[PDB]
Design a protein around this ligand. Structure first.
Ligand code: MG
Ligand code: MG
Ligand code: MG
Ligand code: MG
Ligand code: MG
Ligand code: MG
Ligand code: MG
Ligand code: MG
Ligand code: MG
Ligand code: MG
Lengths: 79, 96, 150, 114, 98, 127
RNA sequence: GGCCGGGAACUCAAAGGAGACUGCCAGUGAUAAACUGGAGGAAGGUGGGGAUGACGUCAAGUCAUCAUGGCCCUUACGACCAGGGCUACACACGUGCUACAAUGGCGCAUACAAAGAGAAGCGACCUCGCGAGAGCAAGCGGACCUCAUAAAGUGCGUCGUAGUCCGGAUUGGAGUCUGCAACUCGACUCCAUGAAGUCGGAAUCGCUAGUAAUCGUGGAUCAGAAUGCCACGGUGAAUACGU
RNA sequence: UCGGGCUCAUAACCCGA
RNA sequence: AUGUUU
């Protein structure tokens, strides 16, 4: 999130997301970069953020921007 | 230490003597307000296992990634141990 | 333990001249800010002036006389039991005991400034009242009530 | 009338008193005072009507007391409706801003039950 | 003029050093500011001895780096190399620039 | 004549300028009270003069360098004393008697590696 | 304007020394040692602080610094990469930091130290920014410049013993930067919020003097995250019969 | 009963709930 | 009081 002027992102995904967005849709996109700022273009895309074991398919609304896939994805355990 | 690790680190060093040795700024100037695109900043996938902040020290003599001394290069054990003999010019045990 | 010492005196009164008085400024002094101690132990008498009148010099010691004890007890274990054998304190620590207990209550006044929180007790002695003067005779209680000892 | 809305803390220095206004600190307090020529100090006794009613015109320009606390109470809710860490941690009564959860935590989760 | 900042981990490379350094160019006499003592940059270095725990031990050291000024004023070309060329020194360090 | 007074103690180092006559002091482009004055009993500068007078007798204009407050002025004390020998190298036996000629040997204490402050050490409950 | 020349007087710097040794005086004391006072001296009776840790004990600690007897793994207990974790929590303990406040808080102006730091470094100056800081760019490899603008303290405005003009946790929104990269897990700033807490049970620790106590300063490690460690000075006590 | 302290450690003892 | 644990 905190990225002053020009947030950070991992090209690895950019060349996978929109790369598959143009042609309708298909199977969930296995992400991995929890340190990447959610893109307002990957809207409700069928993906999945890695949690250190598997990936959790989550979507962002018109209220999540500076956040990263990490936020909407647990990486620990308790209770 | 551990030769297997020592070497693994050696790689993290040479890479700087290459990519960071100069091309580090070849994109830097295009990173800070110097208009200014984003393409370079976007296709920024050159410095991976390479980073001017991922190189550890480890006692030069041995290889302990802790208790390092810039003025020297070894760790507390070796340094002290060596200084005792005299492999360091002007390094008598301090005592104000 | 096996050695003996004398005493650790220092620079007396800034002008009124009074070695022991320094203690009242030191004993009260905290955080090693003697620079401020002189601001309280001195300004104090400057307030008791109208309060009492006669030389603030005497004013102090005057009421101070009704605060300094003259007999205390020291725990001494014997055959399992630890008696509270009494003992008449010499002047040296006597005057001291007072100052300690004196400055203490003064800082327990719980009002506003210490300048006043100090004068109050400085005069409360003569007129009799306060926590400071309390201890004075309060100590006498334990005293003699144990005369069966010393 | 109540300086800006409910509760009229009077008989106290301008600023220090204005601080009683739920939504203004030692900064936003003095800043607006100068915009009215009001003396950041002195009791409100020496003040006058024009030294209070006008302070509202500008105080309203900013969301305070009322909607403010509601705004924040909602912020907390907005930060939960989503299965995101920050938003989730904001529910189990545990802290959500880099803090150990093994020692010293009797603030976000109140006192312990020994 | 030419300066000569000295710096060594002992007087050995200074005592009988700076001296000759002065009576070298001026085989008979010359200006030259002359030798001087100056302060002493000291870098205390402390380290833990016993391995594993026992951080309460430690052993401190200090590399005493001495220095001298000197500096020649009159660059008598007849004595210039009479000091430069005669640059022996058992491994010291004396700067020279203006 | 242009006398001299070490007056260098407790990390401080003054220069007692004992001039002929004029008991006026002007340390660091300012007078006694026009500096450290009104902060401590620094008036102890005349303390030494309290054995043979001053004013028209001699001058006590000084100027200290380095050290702490009570140190600077305090240094002058131990200095002025010895700084009066040029007026009577035999009157010195009238200053030490009141703590003067003797330099304040008391200074800070080197912090020892292992103690909170070269004397005090952390507590040990589970000891 | 130590700003010019100039002067080498002064502090200072720092290599070589001078010095303290029951050495001298008296008493005591076996007219022994030694002790107790004295003089002289900056310094007295191992001057103060360092470093230095006997033969050994706890089969005390460290195969994880490293070395090494044996033993063990050998498409692996070897090796490389990405993400996660060591930064969990329903609790408990140790060492710490900050307050609970007027010997105080905040606004003004102001008074003074010591020791260290530094070319992928310290970075002045001036511009813009509330601000972190960003831009420009000199100087110093350094008793030459930058770090460096000590803090307590001092004199005024004030506030009046209120949980406040105290205290600062917490949290929300907005930002800066160090970095591929700061959700997981970074330091700082801006505004808003303002915690518990009013001096702490049984119990328990430290400290004999420039000590305790308090107030600041620098270093190391180090891209960027010190309430820690190491070191420096400012100021600056009480008390000590006695075992 | 539990949580803390006391001891080298238990119990006991002390504190708190 | 005990410790192979009042
Ligand atoms: Mg190996
Ligand atoms: Mg690193
Ligand atoms: Mg100190
Ligand atoms: Mg010895
Ligand atoms: Mg092995
Ligand atoms: Mg850990
Ligand atoms: Mg640094
Ligand atoms: Mg640091
Ligand atoms: Mg039994
Ligand atoms: Mg049994």
């Amino acid at each position: 999130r905190s990225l002053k002027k020009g947030p950070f992102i991992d090209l690895h995904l950019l060349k996978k997301v929109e790369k598959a967005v143009e042609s309708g849709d298909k199977k969930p996109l296995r992400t991995w970069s929890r340190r990447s700022t959610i893109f307002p273009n990957m809207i409700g895309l069928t993906i999945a953020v890695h949690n250190g074991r598997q990936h959790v398919p989550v979507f962002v609304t018109d209220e999540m921007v500076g956040h990263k896939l990490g936020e909407f994805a647990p990486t620990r355990t308790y209770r | 230490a551990k030769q297997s690790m020592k070497a693994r680190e050696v790689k993290r060093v040479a890479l700087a003597d290459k990519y960071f040795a100069k091309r580090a700024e070849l994109k830097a100037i295009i990173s800070d307000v110097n208009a200014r695109w984003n393409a370079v900043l976007k296709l920024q996938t050159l410095p991976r296992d390479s980073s001017p902040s991922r190189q550890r020290n480890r006692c030069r003599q041995t290889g302990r990634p802790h208790g390092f001394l810039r003025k020297f290069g070894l760790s507390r054990i070796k340094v002290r141990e060596a200084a005792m003999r005299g492999e360091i010019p002007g390094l008598k045990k301090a005592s104000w | 333990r096996r050695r003996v010492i004398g005493q650790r005196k220092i620079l007396p009164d800034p002008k009124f001249g009074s070695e022991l008085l320094a203690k009242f400024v030191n004993i009260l002094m905290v955080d090693g800010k003697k620079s401020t101690a002189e601001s309280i132990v001195y300004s104090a008498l400057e307030t008791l002036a109208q309060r009492s009148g006669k030389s603030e010099l005497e004013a102090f010691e005057v009421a101070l006389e009704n605060v300094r004890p003259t007999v205390e007890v020291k725990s001494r274990r014997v055959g399992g039991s630890t008696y509270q054998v009494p003992v008449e304190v010499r002047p040296v620590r006597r005057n001291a005991l007072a100052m300690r207990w004196i400055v203490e209550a003064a800082r327990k006044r719980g009002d506003k400034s210490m300048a006043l929180r100090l004068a109050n007790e400085l005069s409360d002695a003569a007129e009799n009242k306060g926590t400071a003067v309390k201890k004075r005779e309060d100590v006498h209680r334990m005293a003699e009530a144990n005369k069966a000892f010393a | 009338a109540r300086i800006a809305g409910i509760n009229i803390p009077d008989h106290k220095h301008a600023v220090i008193a204005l601080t009683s206004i739920y939504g203004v600190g030692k900064t936003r307090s003095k800043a607006i005072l100068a915009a009215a020529g009001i003396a950041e100090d002195v009791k409100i006794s020496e003040l006058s009507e024009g030294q209070i009613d006008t302070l509202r015109d500008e105080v309203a320009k900013f969301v305070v007391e009322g909607d403010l606390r509601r705004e924040i109470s909602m912020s907390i809710k907005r930060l939960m409706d989503l299965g995101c860490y920050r938003g989730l941690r904001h529910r189990r009564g545990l802290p959500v801003r880099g803090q150990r959860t093994k020692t010293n935590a009797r603030t976000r989760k109140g006192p312990r039950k020994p | 003029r030419i300066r000569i900042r000295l710096k060594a981990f002992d007087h050995r490379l200074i005592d009988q050093a700076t001296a000759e350094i002065v009576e070298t160019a001026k085989r008979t006499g010359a200006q030259v500011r002359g030798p001087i003592p100056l302060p002493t940059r000291k870098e205390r270095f402390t380290v833990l001895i016993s391995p594993h725990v026992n951080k309460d031990a430690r052993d401190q050291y200090e590399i005493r780096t001495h220095l001298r000024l000197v500096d020649i004023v009159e660059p008598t070309e007849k004595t210039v190399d009479a000091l430069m060329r005669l640059d022996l020194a058992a491994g010291v360090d004396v700067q020279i620039s203006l | 004549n242009q006398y001299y007074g070490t007056g260098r103690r407790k990390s401080s180092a003054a220069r007692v300028f004992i001039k002929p006559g004029n008991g006026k002091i002007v340390i660091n482009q300012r007078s006694l009270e026009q500096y450290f004055g009104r902060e401590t009993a620094r008036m102890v500068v005349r303390q030494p003069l309290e054995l043979v007078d001053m004013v028209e007798k001699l001058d006590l204009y000084i100027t200290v360098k380095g050290g702490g407050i009570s140190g600077q002025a305090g240094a002058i004390r131990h200095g002025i004393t010895r700084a009066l020998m040029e007026y009577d190298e035999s009157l010195r036996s009238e200053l030490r008697k009141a703590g003067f000629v003797t330099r304040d040997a008391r200074q800070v204490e080197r912090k020892k590696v292992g103690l909170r402050k070269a004397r005090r050490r952390p507590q040990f409950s589970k000891r």
